Amino acid sequence: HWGYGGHNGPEHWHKDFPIAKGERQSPVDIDTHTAKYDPSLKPLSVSYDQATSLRILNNGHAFNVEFDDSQDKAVLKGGPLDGTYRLIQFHFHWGSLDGQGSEHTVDKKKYAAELHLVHWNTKYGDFGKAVQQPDGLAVLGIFLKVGSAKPGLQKVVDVLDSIKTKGKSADFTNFDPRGLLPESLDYWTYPGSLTTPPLLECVTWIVLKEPISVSSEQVLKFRKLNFNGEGEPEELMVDNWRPAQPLKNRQIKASFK
């Protein structure tokens, strides 16, 4: 029953999911002056040329674009990672207004939205086994700011009318997630968690420094989605973000000087 409503939002999650008060929770504020440049970090390798998108789903919390993850098609490697991580889905978090929406913050700056590309470690065989391990997942986070349109986002925006409510899905083949990346792959990294219940502490976060630009119209169309199911009282799908959580005994590392 968790959500982002007036009585089931992030501040209530800990009652069903006590790990919400744990030691490695996400997101966090990235204090750029305390993050350490780590010259041992490698460039990120994002290999999406063979990615196979399948479907887009409104799950009641966000929409997920799902991929075929039964072979090494779309993988993330390098950076802080050991081994190979396969893309399973991406989704976004966004606000009701342009001044909030992101989950991670940068020196307390909130962006309008955040993209998460979720990948699982192939040495565990499946996503459900991977989430039980401290190196199971790698999530690439990309901030969105409102300005110029992102051409490679428009196919996502145009299908949202067809998945307005919880439990609706649409065929979403042939989408190229390379079109959602910024120019630079400089990043920050730290060990954390899923940002939705069950909030499992299985994620190596890789948060890009350079935001992508989207238009005001593109984000406006995200905000016309619904959290509810068909025929239920309309609840616009906005402010589906968890606020920043305590960093505790963790180090944020930067890939760049």
Binding flags for Zn ion, 190-219, as an x/- string (CB under 5 A)? -----x------------------------
The window from 48-56, 69-77, 116-124, 201-209 that contacts Zn ion (CB under 5 A) reads 116-124
The window from 23-31, 34-42, 53-61, 112-120 that contacts Zn ion (CB under 5 A) reads 112-120
Select 50 or 121, whichever has its Cβ closest to Zn ion.
Answer: 121
Residue 198, preceding peptide bond in cis (omega within 30° of 0): yes
Answer yes or no: are the C-beta atoms of 169 and 58 closer than 8 Å: yes
Residue 1 assigned ligand-binding role: no
Residue 116 assigned ligand-binding role: yes
Residue 91 assigned ligand-binding role: yes
SS (H, E, C) 153-221: HHHHHHHHHHHCCCCCEEECCCCCHHHHCCCCCCEEEEEECCCCCCCCCCEEEEEECCCEEECHHHHHH
Taking the complex as a whole, the smallest distance from the CB of residue 113 to Zn ion amounts, in Å, to 11
Please report whether residue 116 would count as binding Zn ion according to CB under 5 A: yes
| Phi, psi of 90, deg, nearest 5 | -130, 155
Please report whether residue 104 would count as binding Zn ion according to CB under 5 A: no
Two tokens, residue 158: 């145009």
Residue 7 assigned ligand-binding role: no
Taking the complex as a whole, the smallest distance from the CB of residue 143 to Zn ion amounts, in Å, to 12
User: What's the number of CA atoms in the CB half-sphere (13 Å) around residue 89?
Assistant: 13
- Based on C-alpha coordinates, what's the Rg of the chain? 17
Select 116 or 166, whichever has its Cβ closest to Zn ion.
Answer: 116
CA distance to 37, 50, 110, 152, 199, per residue, from 203 (Å) = 20, 24, 21, 26, 10
Residues 128, 133, 134, 140, Cα dihedral to 10°: -30
Taking the complex as a whole, the smallest distance from the CB of residue 141 to Zn ion amounts, in Å, to 8
Select 48 or 241, whichever has its Cβ closest to Zn ion.
Answer: 241
Please report whether residue 119 would count as binding Zn ion according to CB under 5 A: no
Catalytic residue among 1, 14, 33, 61: 61
Annotated active-site residue 61? The verdict is yes
Active-site residues, by number, are: 61
Write out the binding residues for Zn(2+): 91, 93, 116
Write out the binding residues: 91, 93, 116, 195-196
Q: What are the residues binding Zn ion (CB under 5 A)? A: 116, 195
